[PDB]
């Protein structure tokens, strides 16, 4: 096979345009043109799928959120890079160059790419007036339209969204004690876990892919879900009734590493693309199509499409109150493990 010649990237969904969805939205057609390199893309909708698909091989990158770069790390499915290699690793935020999770024991583990938020996505003809809490998916209640929410909400098929819950519970159930959403004791974890036993009986879909997710809010009913702004933005732009809000309970989010796998047998194009994906006019545009926030702080200028206020609205300030994505870790016994929550949210789901 032609060396150097190809680069196989785990992304999640349009963080890896090349025009075909909008010609306007491109950063990997002049990418091929310079280096020779056919990028080919395998989408992923959670963190534990991307997880299993690294662990498996056959991938030279990963945009990993922050619930799989520490797990990628401590399994060695990813190398650590020289960020001299990296012209544009100068340009990054200071917020995210030194971050904890992808920054392990003094060695660089990826590039950053994209931060954002999870926002409650919902119908604007059944919400007049936009929502401000997330009580709307996990509480059975009659919404503006006179209708019983049960069954027309949907929710997160992947089990970090047990961090949803448990900052709901942070706010309705003060008196339990949670701070951080992702380290639980056993009794705020079981309490989340009763929440999310309630929200059950209202739940449409658990939601993985986001064309099924978008077609639900277009054709069975679904009017209110944890979202991505990407989602939001595509049924936005096919005419859809979708907004969404930063509800008052906070929001938990995701920063995104580019991440070269241990056994990558095109890492020289792999670096390439790390080099590439920092450069400002490809930050904005990717913010501008997905709803995140680049990661070059000078791409909030650079990109048309994001528009001179695209970075603010998107939410390039909410930065510090992001609970970001991570994996839920022991600690000794002290806190509920991510096991855990894998083992049941699946039966949590399942009415189990």
Same mark, same amino acid.
């Given at each position: 096979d032609k060396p150097e010649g190809r680069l196989d990237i785990i992304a999640w969904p349009g963080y890896i345009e090349r025009?075909?969805?909008?010609?306007?939205?491109d950063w990997v057609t002049q990418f091929e043109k310079e280096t020779g390199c056919a990028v080919n893309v395998k989408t992923a909708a959670t963190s534990d799928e991307m997880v299993s698909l690294m662990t498996k091989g056959g991938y030279d990158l990963v945009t990993a959120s922050g619930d799989a770069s520490l797990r990628l790390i401590m399994? @060695?499915?990813? /190398? $650590?890079?020289?960020?001299?290699?990296? +012209?544009?690793?100068? #340009?990054?935020?200071?917020?995210?160059?030194?971050?904890?999770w992808f920054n392990v024991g003094g060695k660089v583990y990826g590039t950053p790419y994209q931060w954002g938020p999870n926002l409650l996505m919902y119908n604007t003809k059944t919400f007049p007036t936009p929502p401000d809490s997330w009580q709307v998916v996990f509480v059975e209640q009659n919404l503006p339209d006179g209708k019983s929410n049960k069954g027309r909400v949907q929710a997160y098929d992947g089990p970090?969204?047990?961090?949803?819950?448990?900052?709901?519970? @942070?706010?309705? /159930? $003060?008196?339990?004690?949670?701070?951080? +959403?992702?380290?639980? #004791?056993?009794?705020?974890?079981?309490?989340?876990?009763?929440?999310?036993?309630?929200?059950?009986?209202?739940?449409?879909?658990?939601?993985?892919?986001?064309?099924?997710?978008?077609?639900?809010?277009?054709?069975?009913?679904v009017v209110a879900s944890s979202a991505w702004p990407y989602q939001a933005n595509a049924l936005k732009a096919e005419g859809q009734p979708v907004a969404t809000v930063f509800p008052k309970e906070g929001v938990?989010?995701?920063?995104?590493?580019?991440?070269?796998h241990s056994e990558a047998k095109h890492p020289v194009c792999a670096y390439k693309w790390m080099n590439w994906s920092l450069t400002p006019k490809v930050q904005g545009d990717v913010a501008a199509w997905f709803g995140s926030?680049?990661?070059v702080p000078e791409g909030c200028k650079a990109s048309p499409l994001l528009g001179e206020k695209g970075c603010e609205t998107n939410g390039f300030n909410y930065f510090d109150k992001i609970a970001f994505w991570k994996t839920p870790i022991a600690?000794?016994?002290?806190?509920?493990?991510?096991?855990?929550?894998?083992?049941d949210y699946i039966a949590i789901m399942g009415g189990r």
């Open positions: 025009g075909q969805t909008d010609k306007q939205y399994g @060695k499915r990813v /190398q $650590p890079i020289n960020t001299a290699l990296i +012209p544009n690793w100068k #340009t990054l935020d200071p917020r995210v160059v030194k971050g904890d970090i969204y047990i961090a949803d819950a448990a900052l709901f519970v @942070k706010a309705t /159930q $003060p008196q339990l004690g949670i701070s951080d +959403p992702y380290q639980l #004791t056993e009794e705020q974890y079981q309490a989340v876990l009763k929440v999310l036993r309630a929200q059950h009986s209202l739940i449409h879909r658990y939601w993985h892919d986001t064309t099924v997710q978008m077609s639900d809010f277009k054709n069975e009913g938990t989010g995701w920063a995104d590493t580019t991440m070269l926030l680049p990661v600690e000794g016994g002290k806190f509920v493990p991510y096991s855990r929550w894998t083992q």
